Design a protein around this motif. Structure first.
Motif, PDB file in Angstrom:
ATOM      1  N   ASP A  36       0.802  -1.214   0.000  1.00  0.00           N
ATOM      2  CA  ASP A  36       0.000   0.000   0.000  1.00  0.00           C
ATOM      3  C   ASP A  36       0.839   1.270   0.000  1.00  0.00           C
ATOM      4  N   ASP A  37       2.151   1.161   0.179  1.00  0.00           N
ATOM      5  CA  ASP A  37       3.025   2.312   0.341  1.00  0.00           C
ATOM      6  C   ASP A  37       4.037   2.394  -0.799  1.00  0.00           C
ATOM      7  N   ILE A  38       3.622   2.008  -2.002  1.00  0.00           N
ATOM      8  CA  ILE A  38       4.410   2.217  -3.213  1.00  0.00           C
ATOM      9  C   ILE A  38       3.470   2.684  -4.312  1.00  0.00           C
ATOM     10  N   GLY A  39       3.860   3.731  -5.021  1.00  0.00           N
ATOM     11  CA  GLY A  39       3.057   4.243  -6.115  1.00  0.00           C
ATOM     12  C   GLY A  39       3.921   4.540  -7.319  1.00  0.00           C
ATOM     13  N   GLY A  40       3.344   4.323  -8.497  1.00  0.00           N
ATOM     14  CA  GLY A  40       4.046   4.598  -9.735  1.00  0.00           C
ATOM     15  C   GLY A  40       5.195   3.663 -10.037  1.00  0.00           C
ATOM     16  N   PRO A  94      18.136   6.873  -9.904  1.00  0.00           N
ATOM     17  CA  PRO A  94      18.577   8.085  -9.221  1.00  0.00           C
ATOM     18  C   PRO A  94      18.292   7.996  -7.734  1.00  0.00           C
ATOM     19  N   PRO A  95      19.089   8.662  -6.901  1.00  0.00           N
ATOM     20  CA  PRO A  95      18.873   8.580  -5.454  1.00  0.00           C
ATOM     21  C   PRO A  95      17.543   9.188  -5.048  1.00  0.00           C
ATOM     22  N   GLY A  96      16.924   8.579  -4.042  1.00  0.00           N
ATOM     23  CA  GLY A  96      15.657   9.054  -3.537  1.00  0.00           C
ATOM     24  C   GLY A  96      14.431   8.537  -4.253  1.00  0.00           C
ATOM     25  N   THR A  97      14.583   7.614  -5.200  1.00  0.00           N
ATOM     26  CA  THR A  97      13.422   7.068  -5.891  1.00  0.00           C
ATOM     27  C   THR A  97      12.754   5.935  -5.127  1.00  0.00           C
ATOM     28  N   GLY A  98      13.315   5.514  -3.999  1.00  0.00           N
ATOM     29  CA  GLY A  98      12.662   4.525  -3.166  1.00  0.00           C
ATOM     30  C   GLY A  98      13.024   3.093  -3.489  1.00  0.00           C
ATOM     31  N   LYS A  99      14.319   2.779  -3.502  1.00  0.00           N
ATOM     32  CA  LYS A  99      14.731   1.398  -3.729  1.00  0.00           C
ATOM     33  C   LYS A  99      14.731   0.601  -2.432  1.00  0.00           C
ATOM     34  N   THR A 100      15.364   1.139  -1.387  1.00  0.00           N
ATOM     35  CA  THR A 100      15.351   0.455  -0.101  1.00  0.00           C
ATOM     36  C   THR A 100      13.933   0.253   0.401  1.00  0.00           C
ATOM     37  N   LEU A 101      13.009   1.134   0.023  1.00  0.00           N
ATOM     38  CA  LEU A 101      11.620   0.926   0.406  1.00  0.00           C
ATOM     39  C   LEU A 101      11.029  -0.272  -0.325  1.00  0.00           C
ATOM     40  N   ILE A 102      11.407  -0.474  -1.590  1.00  0.00           N
ATOM     41  CA  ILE A 102      10.954  -1.658  -2.316  1.00  0.00           C
ATOM     42  C   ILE A 102      11.471  -2.921  -1.644  1.00  0.00           C
ATOM     43  N   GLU A 112      -0.019   9.573  -7.670  1.00  0.00           N
ATOM     44  CA  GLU A 112      -0.161   8.494  -6.697  1.00  0.00           C
ATOM     45  C   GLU A 112       0.688   8.745  -5.457  1.00  0.00           C
ATOM     46  N   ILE A 113       1.924   9.208  -5.642  1.00  0.00           N
ATOM     47  CA  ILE A 113       2.784   9.485  -4.495  1.00  0.00           C
ATOM     48  C   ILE A 113       2.170  10.571  -3.626  1.00  0.00           C
ATOM     49  N   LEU A 114       1.688  11.645  -4.254  1.00  0.00           N
ATOM     50  CA  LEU A 114       1.077  12.726  -3.490  1.00  0.00           C
ATOM     51  C   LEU A 114      -0.163  12.243  -2.754  1.00  0.00           C
ATOM     52  N   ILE A 116      -0.688   9.263  -1.666  1.00  0.00           N
ATOM     53  CA  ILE A 116      -0.259   8.410  -0.561  1.00  0.00           C
ATOM     54  C   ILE A 116       0.213   9.253   0.615  1.00  0.00           C
ATOM     55  N   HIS A 117       1.037  10.268   0.346  1.00  0.00           N
ATOM     56  CA  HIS A 117       1.670  11.001   1.441  1.00  0.00           C
ATOM     57  C   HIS A 117       0.674  11.876   2.194  1.00  0.00           C
ATOM     58  N   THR A 118      -0.259  12.508   1.484  1.00  0.00           N
ATOM     59  CA  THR A 118      -1.222  13.408   2.118  1.00  0.00           C
ATOM     60  C   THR A 118      -2.369  12.612   2.743  1.00  0.00           C
ATOM     61  N   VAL A 163      11.285  13.490  -7.544  1.00  0.00           N
ATOM     62  CA  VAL A 163      11.330  12.110  -7.079  1.00  0.00           C
ATOM     63  C   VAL A 163      10.511  12.005  -5.800  1.00  0.00           C
ATOM     64  N   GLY A 164      10.515  10.832  -5.168  1.00  0.00           N
ATOM     65  CA  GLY A 164       9.685  10.640  -3.988  1.00  0.00           C
ATOM     66  C   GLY A 164      10.076  11.538  -2.828  1.00  0.00           C
ATOM     67  N   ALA A 165      11.378  11.655  -2.566  1.00  0.00           N
ATOM     68  CA  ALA A 165      11.834  12.449  -1.431  1.00  0.00           C
ATOM     69  C   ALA A 165      11.446  13.911  -1.590  1.00  0.00           C
ATOM     70  N   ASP A 166      11.539  14.435  -2.812  1.00  0.00           N
ATOM     71  CA  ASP A 166      11.144  15.817  -3.050  1.00  0.00           C
ATOM     72  C   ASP A 166       9.671  16.026  -2.738  1.00  0.00           C
ATOM     73  N   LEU A 167       8.822  15.067  -3.105  1.00  0.00           N
ATOM     74  CA  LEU A 167       7.395  15.210  -2.840  1.00  0.00           C
ATOM     75  C   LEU A 167       7.091  15.118  -1.347  1.00  0.00           C
ATOM     76  N   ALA A 168       7.787  14.236  -0.627  1.00  0.00           N
ATOM     77  CA  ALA A 168       7.608  14.190   0.821  1.00  0.00           C
ATOM     78  C   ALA A 168       8.016  15.510   1.468  1.00  0.00           C
ATOM     79  N   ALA A 169       9.161  16.060   1.055  1.00  0.00           N
ATOM     80  CA  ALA A 169       9.591  17.347   1.590  1.00  0.00           C
ATOM     81  C   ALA A 169       8.602  18.444   1.227  1.00  0.00           C
TER      82      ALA A 169
END
Ligand SMILES: Nc1ncnc2c1ncn2[C@@H]1O[C@H](COP(=O)(O)OP(=O)(O)O)[C@@H](O)[C@H]1O
Ligand SMILES: Nc1ncnc2c1ncn2[C@@H]1O[C@H](COP(=O)(O)OP(=O)(O)O)[C@@H](O)[C@H]1O
Lengths: 743, 130
Positions: free
Chosen positions: A183-187, A225-233, A358-360, A362-364, A386-392
């Motif tokens: 449920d915590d991965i999008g795109g 690229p860094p911050g795209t969410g690999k460790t999360l996968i 989808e990321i937005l 999920i985060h909001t 990327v994902g980190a930018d949207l979280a920030a």
């Protein structure tokens, strides 16, 4: 499988009791007072005492709420129960209260609660168990963190307990191993699907896979690229299938002490070997294993060779899967690509517009948005994120909402905590500010995505659309006919015509129709890659086009090579030929198995190198004429969407008048009309402005501002500045070349 | 409580000035040049002279650095302001310099520093301040 058991409500309220049915009780051979192991979801264990009950059904197990919270399950779930007759008597335990249970108690917990509950109780305990204690007036919650032996022990009269310590938090931060499911991965639909496909079997069912006798994968590369969410996968996959995710960080392993670094890595591998199906994650692989020529010292070579040896030492052993993350595929030592080591490569790319939405979304989730958020445009105006930018971005939006609100002289009594988030929301202005004050990190990365231009956007050109759908749609949808009949499909199409006729529109349209990725290599970059870097850049662009099949690679302004070659310099000729020759060599190395389509576009066909125009390479030549009659009406309608078109007037006569006009002129006219309209609107607004300043209180009532009056007169004044983009003689040259083509 | 205010950076660098908005003066019936009594943290106290300034907001009070350190408060906190009209002309003043500020002067400090600073100023002071 007579172990699966649905859960049910319990009769008695004792913490360490579950009610069992007699048929199962005799089937499983249990006795009164024994201890069993309860396994639930999210890798949680439980120890209990089996009790008999005729009322409970065979399929249902009677169990209370505390055990349900400990196992993190709910009603209707499935829990497996296993006998545990090898329990070891404990000798010492450590128990601590939760933070929100000892408010204003100030007493010794050993005698008030612990002593009455633990006397002649014989209640086994395990790490992570949360249990409730009922006493005078408060339900005290306790946490057991240390025991001997671990994690199985039984409270006995000859035991020592300790409850001296600060009240521990609820679960501190241990949410990762409970959260981050799918449920915590999008795109990332395709990549996640591939990982689930190629990892589920070796981790879920090891016995069958052992029985079959087939080699499992032993390494997977996730590069992006860094911050795209690999460790999360990796975390999500390990937490979903059920494993022993064990992270190894690059920098910390590097600088431990001099020559003892490899000892820690070997200890990590040894620990992972002994502890069931597990996933080992190596982060920042390039930080410890760079290219061999890059390395200068000697310890780095020792570390790389130790990693290689420990990787090749995974013959059979157990069911261990190694996953690594890196930034650039060519930055890894090529020795770490042989068969047996990392061999499978998965690409995690930058999210697209739907992925960003989808990321937005999920985060909001914690934030309580206002009824004015339309995240579609907020997503589509953030290209290069990327994902980190949207979280920030979400965090900054919340903080700016606080700024626009503030704790207005609000004395911080900790009372204003919940109504902080449960009074507020977010409005467009906050998100627009955050977008304005944002730092994108992607920028210069080639984008692979399906373009959204459809057949309706272009106008007319029926025959060219027919020919393209002939050369592209048929071989991919009906390959059986070609295979049976025995033909080789064409591989390239070259577009030549006067400039500004809509070639890239047509390429994007066919890309959308085929539902395939699109990669554009513009003229300036092609001209840049002459001076040096004439091999690499072409190599990775062709490799990226191949790996993400299907795609329609696009080469724009192909004549720029010989256009810049000819002049007063004559020094880029070697560069010109080398670039064209890497292009040709890579093109001839293509295989028909992959559905990679090459399209090149140019406006000066008489100068192109003739070696390109050979069978196997770009062969078919398609001529794009200037729009005429119905095409002009169609393009005028296509450009006429806007928001403010009002009711407007006919477009037929405008198409009738212009003769010798391309798409550039029509778009220029369309922009000119809107510019005139906007200028008129603003001067009217300024007129109202200084007439209010001349007459105060003259417009206390909010009279409507001028509407979007895009009038005929404004259009007729604006398009009066009509320009002929193309000359006339070029048409004759093109038609002469076309007649030369036909024989 | 429409008496407290939140401290803020000031522009006037004199040691006995504060900047309040005109609606605050209208609400508290505050004139120009009156003596106001300022309460803060740690049970510290000082007096000042009210000056008009429109730049500061109504809920915001502007004050310099010496008074801010006198009150032992930092910017962003809250102080209590009131009119204090019972003050009358002093009789005698005892002042003593700090040790780590006069290293190597050895002169008549009265004629050098105190005489110009206290000249025609009518600066109100409270015991214990710096
Ligand atoms: N669906 C998603 N896709 C990409 N990134 C995400 C997604 N959901 C969350 N993230 C962000 O990814 C971050 C964690 O990934 P990160 O550790 O940066 O990976 P890496 O270390 O490989 O860059 C989290 O802080 C989270 O904000
Ligand atoms: N079917 C069409 N006929 C003519 N012009 C079009 C058509 N579709 C779009 N256009 C307009 O013509 C322009 C095409 O520019 P572009 O194709 O990038 O130049 P070039 O044709 O040199 O590649 C676009 O701005 C578009 O608005």
């Amino acid at each position: 499988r007579p172990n699966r058991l649905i859960v049910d409500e319990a009769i008695n309220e004792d913490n360490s009791v579950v009610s069992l049915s007699q048929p199962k009780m005799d089937e499983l051979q249990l006795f009164r007072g024994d201890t069993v192991l309860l396994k639930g979801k999210k890798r949680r264990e439980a120890v209990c005492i089996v009790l008999s009950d005729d009322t409970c059904s065979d399929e249902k197990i009677r169990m209370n709420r505390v055990v349900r919270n400990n196992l993190r399950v709910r009603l209707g779930d499935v829990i497996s129960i296993q006998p545990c007759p090898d329990v070891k008597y404990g000798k010492r335990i450590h128990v601590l209260p939760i933070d929100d249970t000892v408010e204003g108690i100030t007493g010794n917990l050993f005698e008030v609660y612990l002593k009455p509950y633990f006397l002649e109780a014989y209640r086994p305990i395990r790490k992570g168990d949360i249990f409730l204690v009922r006493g005078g007036m408060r339900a005290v919650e306790f946490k057991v963190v240390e025991t001997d032996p671990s994690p199985y022990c039984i409270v006995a009269p000859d035991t020592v307990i300790h409850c001296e310590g600060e009240p521990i938090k609820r679960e501190d931060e241990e949410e990762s191993l409970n959260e981050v499911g799918y449920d915590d991965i999008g795109g990332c639909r395709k990549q996640l699907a591939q990982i689930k496909e190629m990892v589920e079997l070796p981790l879920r069912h090891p016995a069958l896979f052992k029985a079959i006798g087939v080699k499992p994968p032993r390494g997977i590369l996730l590069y992006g690229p860094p911050g795209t969410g690999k460790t999360l996968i990796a975390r999500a996959v390990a937490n979903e299938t059920g494993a022993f995710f064990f992270l190894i960080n690059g920098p910390e392993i590097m600088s431990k002490l001099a020559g003892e670094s490899e000892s820690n890595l070997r200890k990590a591998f040894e620990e992972a070997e002994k502890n069931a199906p597990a996933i080992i994650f190596i982060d920042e692989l390039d930080a410890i294993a760079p290219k061999r020529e890059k390395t200068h010292g000697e310890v780095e070579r020792r570390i790389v060779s130790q990693l290689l040896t420990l990787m090749d030492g995974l013959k059979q052993r157990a069911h261990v899967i190694v996953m690594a993350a890196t930034n650039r595929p060519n930055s890894i030592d090529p020795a770490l690509r042989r068969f047996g080591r990392f061999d499978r490569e998965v690409d995690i790319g930058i999210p697209d517009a739907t992925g960003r939405l989808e990321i937005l979304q999920i985060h909001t989730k914690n934030m309580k948005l206002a009824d004015d958020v339309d995240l579609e445009q907020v997503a589509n105006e953030t290209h290069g994120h990327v994902g980190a930018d949207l979280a920030a971005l979400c965090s900054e939006a919340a903080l700016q909402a606080i700024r626009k609100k503030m704790d207005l002289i609000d004395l911080e009594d900790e009372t204003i905590d919940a109504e902080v988030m449960n009074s507020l929301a977010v409005t467009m202005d906050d998100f627009r500010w955050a977008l304005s004050q944002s730092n994108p990190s992607a920028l210069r990365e080639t984008v692979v995505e399906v373009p959204q231009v459809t057949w309706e956007d272009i106008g007319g050109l029926e025959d060219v659309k027919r020919e393209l759908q002939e050369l592209v749609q048929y071989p991919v949808e009906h390959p059986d006919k070609f295979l049976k009949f025995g033909m080789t499909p064409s591989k390239g199409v070259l577009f030549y015509g006067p400039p500004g006729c809509g070639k890239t529109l047509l390429a994007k349209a066919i890309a959308n129709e085929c539902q395939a990725n699109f990669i554009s290599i513009k003229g300036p970059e092609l001209l840049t890659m002459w001076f040096g870097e004439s091999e690499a850049n072409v190599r990775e662009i062709f490799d990226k086009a191949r790996q993400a099949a299907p795609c329609v690679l696009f080469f724009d302004e192909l004549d720029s090579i010989a256009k810049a070659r000819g002049g007063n310099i004559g020094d880029g000729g070697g560069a010109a030929d080398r670039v064209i020759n890497q292009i040709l060599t890579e093109m001839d190395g293509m295989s028909t198995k992959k559905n990679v389509f090459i399209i090149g576009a140019t406006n000066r066909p008489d100068i192109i190198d003739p070696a390109i125009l050979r069978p196997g390479r770009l062969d078919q030549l398609i001529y794009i004429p200037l729009p005429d009659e119905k095409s002009r009406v169609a393009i005028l309608k296509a450009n006429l969407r806007k928001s403010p078109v009002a009711k407007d007037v006919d477009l037929e006569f405008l198409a009738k008048m212009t003769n010798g006009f391309s798409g550039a002129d029509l778009t220029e006219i369309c922009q000119r009309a809107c510019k005139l309209a906007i200028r008129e609107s603003i001067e009217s607004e300024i007129r109202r402005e200084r007439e209010r300043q001349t007459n105060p209180s003259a417009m206390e009532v909010e009279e409507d501002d001028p509407v979007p009056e895009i009038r005929r007169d404004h259009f007729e004044e604006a398009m009066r500045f009509a320009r002929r983009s193309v000359s006339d003689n070029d048409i004759r040259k093109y038609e002469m070349f076309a007649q030369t083509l036909q024989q």
